[PDB]
Amino acid sequence: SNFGAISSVLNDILSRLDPPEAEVQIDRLITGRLQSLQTYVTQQLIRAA
Amino acid sequence: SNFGAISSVLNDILSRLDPPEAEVQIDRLITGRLQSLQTYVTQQLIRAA
Amino acid sequence: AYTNSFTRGVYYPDKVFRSSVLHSTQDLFLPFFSNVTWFHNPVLPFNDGVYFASTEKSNIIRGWIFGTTLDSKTQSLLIVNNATNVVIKVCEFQFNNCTFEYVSFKNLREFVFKNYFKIYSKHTPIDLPQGFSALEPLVDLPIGINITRFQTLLAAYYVGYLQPRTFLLKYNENGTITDAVDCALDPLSETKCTLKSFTVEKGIYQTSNFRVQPTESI
Amino acid sequence: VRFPNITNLCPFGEVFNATRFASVYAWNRKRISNCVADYSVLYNSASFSTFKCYGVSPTKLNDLCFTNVYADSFVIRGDEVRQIAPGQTGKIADYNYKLPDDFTGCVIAWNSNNLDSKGNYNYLYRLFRKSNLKPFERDISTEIYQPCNGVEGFNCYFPLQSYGFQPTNVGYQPYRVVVLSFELAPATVCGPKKSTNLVKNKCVNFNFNGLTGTGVLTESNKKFLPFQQFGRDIADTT
Amino acid sequence: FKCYGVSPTKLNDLCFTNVYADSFVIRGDEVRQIAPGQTGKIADYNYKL
Amino acid sequence: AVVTQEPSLTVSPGGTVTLTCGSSTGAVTSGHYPYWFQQKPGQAPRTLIYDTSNKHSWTPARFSGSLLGGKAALTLSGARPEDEAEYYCLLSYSGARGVFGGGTKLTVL
Amino acid sequence: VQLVESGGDSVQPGGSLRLSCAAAGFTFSSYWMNWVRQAPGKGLEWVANIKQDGSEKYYVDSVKGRFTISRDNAKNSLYLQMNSLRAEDTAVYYCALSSGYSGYAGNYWGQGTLVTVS
Amino acid sequence: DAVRDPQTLEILDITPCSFGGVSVITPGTNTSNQVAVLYQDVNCTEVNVFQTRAGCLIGAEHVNNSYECDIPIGAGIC
Ligand SMILES: *[C@@H]1O[C@H](CO)[C@@H](O)[C@H](O)[C@H]1NC(C)=O
Ligand SMILES: *[C@@H]1O[C@H](CO)[C@@H](O)[C@H](O)[C@H]1NC(C)=O
Ligand SMILES: *[C@@H]1O[C@H](CO)[C@@H](O)[C@H](O)[C@H]1NC(C)=O
Ligand SMILES: *[C@@H]1O[C@H](CO)[C@@H](O)[C@H](O)[C@H]1NC(C)=O
Ligand SMILES: *[C@@H]1O[C@H](CO)[C@@H](O)[C@H](O)[C@H]1NC(C)=O
Ligand SMILES: *[C@@H]1O[C@H](CO)[C@@H](O)[C@H](O)[C@H]1NC(C)=O
Ligand SMILES: *[C@@H]1O[C@H](CO)[C@@H](O)[C@H](O)[C@H]1NC(C)=O
Ligand SMILES: *[C@@H]1O[C@H](CO)[C@@H](O)[C@H](O)[C@H]1NC(C)=O
Ligand SMILES: *[C@@H]1O[C@H](CO)[C@@H](O)[C@H](O)[C@H]1NC(C)=O
Ligand SMILES: *[C@@H]1O[C@H](CO)[C@@H](O)[C@H](O)[C@H]1NC(C)=O
Numbered sequence: 001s002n003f004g005a006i007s008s009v010l011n012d013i014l015s016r017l018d019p020p021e022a023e024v025q026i027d028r029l030i031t032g033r034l035q036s037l038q039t040y041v042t043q044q045l046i047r048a049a
Numbered sequence: 050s051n052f053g054a055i056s057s058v059l060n061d062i063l064s065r066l067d068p069p070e071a072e073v074q075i076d077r078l079i080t081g082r083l084q085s086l087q088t089y090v091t092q093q094l095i096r097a098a
Numbered sequence: 099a100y101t102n103s104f105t106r107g108v109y110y111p112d113k114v115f116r117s118s119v120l121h122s123t124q125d126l127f128l129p130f131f132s133n134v135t136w137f138h139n140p141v142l143p144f145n146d147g148v149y150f151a152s153t154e155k156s157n158i159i160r161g162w163i164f165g166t167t168l169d170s171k172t173q174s175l176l177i178v179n180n181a182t183n184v185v186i187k188v189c190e191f192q193f194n195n196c197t198f199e200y201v202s203f204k205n206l207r208e209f210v211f212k213n214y215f216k217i218y219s220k221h222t223p224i225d226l227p228q229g230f231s232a233l234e235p236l237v238d239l240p241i242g243i244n245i246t247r248f249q250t251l252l253a254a255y256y257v258g259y260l261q262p263r264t265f266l267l268k269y270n271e272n273g274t275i276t277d278a279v280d281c282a283l284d285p286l287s288e289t290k291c292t293l294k295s296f297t298v299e300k301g302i303y304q305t306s307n308f309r310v311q312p313t314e315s316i
Numbered sequence: 317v318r319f320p321n322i323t324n325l326c327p328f329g330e331v332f333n334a335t336r337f338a339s340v341y342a343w344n345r346k347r348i349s350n351c352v353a354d355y356s357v358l359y360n361s362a363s364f365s366t367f368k369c370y371g372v373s374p375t376k377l378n379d380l381c382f383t384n385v386y387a388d389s390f391v392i393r394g395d396e397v398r399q400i401a402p403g404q405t406g407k408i409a410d411y412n413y414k415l416p417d418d419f420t421g422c423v424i425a426w427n428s429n430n431l432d433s434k435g436n437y438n439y440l441y442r443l444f445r446k447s448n449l450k451p452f453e454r455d456i457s458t459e460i461y462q463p464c465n466g467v468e469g470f471n472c473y474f475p476l477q478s479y480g481f482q483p484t485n486v487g488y489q490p491y492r493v494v495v496l497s498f499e500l501a502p503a504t505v506c507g508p509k510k511s512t513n514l515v516k517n518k519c520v521n522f523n524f525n526g527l528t529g530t531g532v533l534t535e536s537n538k539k540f541l542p543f544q545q546f547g548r549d550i551a552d553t554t
Numbered sequence: 555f556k557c558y559g560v561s562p563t564k565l566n567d568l569c570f571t572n573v574y575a576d577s578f579v580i581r582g583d584e585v586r587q588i589a590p591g592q593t594g595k596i597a598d599y600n601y602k603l
Numbered sequence: 604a605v606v607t608q609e610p611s612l613t614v615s616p617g618g619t620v621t622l623t624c625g626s627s628t629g630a631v632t633s634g635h636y637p638y639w640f641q642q643k644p645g646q647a648p649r650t651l652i653y654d655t656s657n658k659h660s661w662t663p664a665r666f667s668g669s670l671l672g673g674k675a676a677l678t679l680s681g682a683r684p685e686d687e688a689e690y691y692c693l694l695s696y697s698g699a700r701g702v703f704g705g706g707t708k709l710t711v712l
Numbered sequence: 713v714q715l716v717e718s719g720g721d722s723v724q725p726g727g728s729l730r731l732s733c734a735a736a737g738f739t740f741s742s743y744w745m746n747w748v749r750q751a752p753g754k755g756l757e758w759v760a761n762i763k764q765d766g767s768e769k770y771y772v773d774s775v776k777g778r779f780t781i782s783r784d785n786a787k788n789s790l791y792l793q794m795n796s797l798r799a800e801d802t803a804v805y806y807c808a809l810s811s812g813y814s815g816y817a818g819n820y821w822g823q824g825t826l827v828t829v830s
Numbered sequence: 831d832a833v834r835d836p837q838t839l840e841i842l843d844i845t846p847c848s849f850g851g852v853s854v855i856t857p858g859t860n861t862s863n864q865v866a867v868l869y870q871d872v873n874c875t876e877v878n879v880f881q882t883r884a885g886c887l888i889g890a891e892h893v894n895n896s897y898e899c900d901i902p903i904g905a906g907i908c
Binding site: 604636638640642647648649650653654657659689691693695698699700701702703704705706 | 744748750755756757758761763768770771772773806808812813814815816817818819820821822823824
């Protein structure tokens, strides 16, 4: 998923943008992927209960 | 709720702002509303337990 | 005269190898069990793209012409198979100022012509036989030609139209598409696409949402 | 590093060093394919007044590889150069040359006062149009803008107006603008890099047609079809 | 019937603070002076816009 | 109902031109909605400028419908041999009873 | 946008002559119709005009009371009749189409018709 | 919930336009490809039709005889 990023692939962001802009696109993927793990972990803990 | 957006009303954002800005304000409403559902669902699952 | 298109009109949507997988994709595909007009010459609409198929014994059909006027004035796309080779040109043909040029019943030939201009095809031995196969990209034409109508150049042939419908495509072990589900054909197909499977177990599944739309404004 | 072993360079000279440029109302386009695009010449050259990239970095262009490169060539006034960008409005951005808000490519421009200025009125722009253009849309029409019907007059005009380029004009001097739109399917135009010896059955840092990552490369029996460039897993990863 | 700051066909869609009606009689040749940017006997000495 | 013009102007190729026109009374403004015409031998007069400064589609953009110090003008940013012609001005007055100037002959050296 | 003007001929002084202009390629009753004359060796002289709907007519004072304009919107044409035509009034008459702000001066011109008085 | 008409002194209720989930009721596809469709919490005018509290069921035959529940719909209906 892109989560608002120009690309879902981290390597494609890094190979295309300089840090001042690449970091913005990466933050969009970090928020989405971190949120995905938080959702996943919450579901694993509830299911585990 | 606005969730940091210019307006809580999606139709207001779409009619008031051109797409380059409207999309940003919409992303804020999506994050807030999607997050609201995640909060709701987590609570329903714990309560269900 | 019309024929039942059955399950034909599927092609590889991209140039990526996949195998042993059910992949959901949306593209311009022929709808399943659609209206394909049966011909045995006229200038037909092109719309979003065209599904073309033919059955031949003497190879009467040689080519196609695509354009907006189909008579000089602007560029038209002429694709003709003659004796030993295929000639493709986009000149301002009267039926100059050429920007692109290239030179390369028992027979069932299937083609997809869609918008640059992409041509997909399949040729197998055999009114339009029922069965399933997927067409593959053969010719990429970087021409930029605006097409609203096309003419078939002469055997029988069938013409259908592509629609932006979602399909679930089944890739076998060798990465060949062997089956497909038209997600907008019927409620069972919707269930199959929803569950990402060609098999649906006994039960009740929520696949969509019904909503009444407004008509007049007050 | 692996690229198709192409020894032919992309004809940027035929775009950037052209003897004549198109009018902005009818900007021309050349499709660049089956070649090696050396972008160090365009980036390092001091002849350019500006070199601004939006979806790519101007210094990564040599590492990147594209499936289709388009060069849009036209002449405008210096004070209109700022309109050749995504997210813009204005006489050129709306009626002569519009870039998509999600544009991927580089806008390169330079002062051509010593080449195009005379007054030189061979460069035209649209002053009037019924509606805004779509991204990369071009249209040639002399239909009178409004109710007049074929008769030019008060409150109705011929759509095109000329630029008056004179050597003594900076905001009113001519600028040559070339926009390189980058479509990112099989590799068609890659940067000025050599292919290295392939190493397999070892952990390597690889670049295949601009696609990069870390992993072990091995021989396989995957039944790739003749038209396919790469494959994907169940997880839709390479 | 000519409008300068607004389109003459949007007058019923628009809303304004106050409007004033300046009502007078002049000679036909001087009607052309009742406009912004004009000069002349009326535009300069009687009724300037 | 009197309009005057400079009888003639000679311009070197590539040189600029200032053709002038005006009324014997008041001053020329946009309220006179001035017109300029070009006539070549054997041809009908062709309008180049209308309503002060609007240029026609058939008129080379080298021509400019500018105003000067209470006078109408038709100027060139660089004259060419093809421009040799008699030029005429027309001003409106109290109504649609315009008056032409005497004519200004433009030649190229 | 074509203006076709005719009626010019060799006539005697003290008589009269009716000239006419037909519109082609455009709507007649949407524009003002002008008349201009040019004596050989001389500049342009304003002669007359007429409003789009024929409700108003304008003349240069020098032809006032002698020149009359009428039109037929169903034929896309207008006529100019000049009475008490003088020997001095030798000129090419031109039809011109006015689409400008006031309608007082033409933008499009016809080829002209020659009136010679002897 | 309701609005006063600005011209006529009457009060009108505003009922949301009918909507709901759509479910497909099916035997396994290894037995039959015949299906019935349930429109959840809607009437049978907006959409062999059986109206139940759970929604408008189209394609299923209404039978007087009860049986053990196989594929549940809701509100006592299977
Ligand atoms: C073709 O379309 C017509 C309606 O125009 C329809 O009656 C006919 O049954 C269709 N034929 C097929 C094979 O679907
Ligand atoms: C293609 O041609 C049709 C007229 O046949 C026109 O209406 C349409 O806008 C054109 N499309 C493009 C992209 O030029
Ligand atoms: C096919 O047509 C082309 C038309 O340009 C012609 O040049 C070519 O020779 C033809 N092929 C054969 C085998 O004659
Ligand atoms: C080809 O281009 C020329 C201009 O170079 C044009 O005059 C000619 O009419 C065009 N051909 C056609 C069929 O229009
Ligand atoms: C894959 O191709 C091989 C021949 O190369 C064939 O024997 C095998 O049956 C094919 N597998 C499938 C699923 O078709
Ligand atoms: C244009 O010409 C100059 C030499 O005058 C050369 O150095 C430059 O690289 C050329 N530009 C391109 C894109 O080839
Ligand atoms: C509007 O006018 C109608 C008569 O046409 C009248 O019956 C109604 O009560 C009026 N409503 C208001 C708010 O004045
Ligand atoms: C599906 O039906 C086939 C017979 O057509 C049978 O052999 C197979 O075991 C059945 N599978 C299941 C899960 O019932
Ligand atoms: C709505 O459903 C009720 C049963 O609950 C029925 O009596 C009524 O007639 C239905 N209305 C419409 C429009 O179908
Ligand atoms: C149930 O039986 C009654 C007669 O007692 C009949 O009227 C009704 O239609 C039947 N309903 C169904 C679903 O069979």
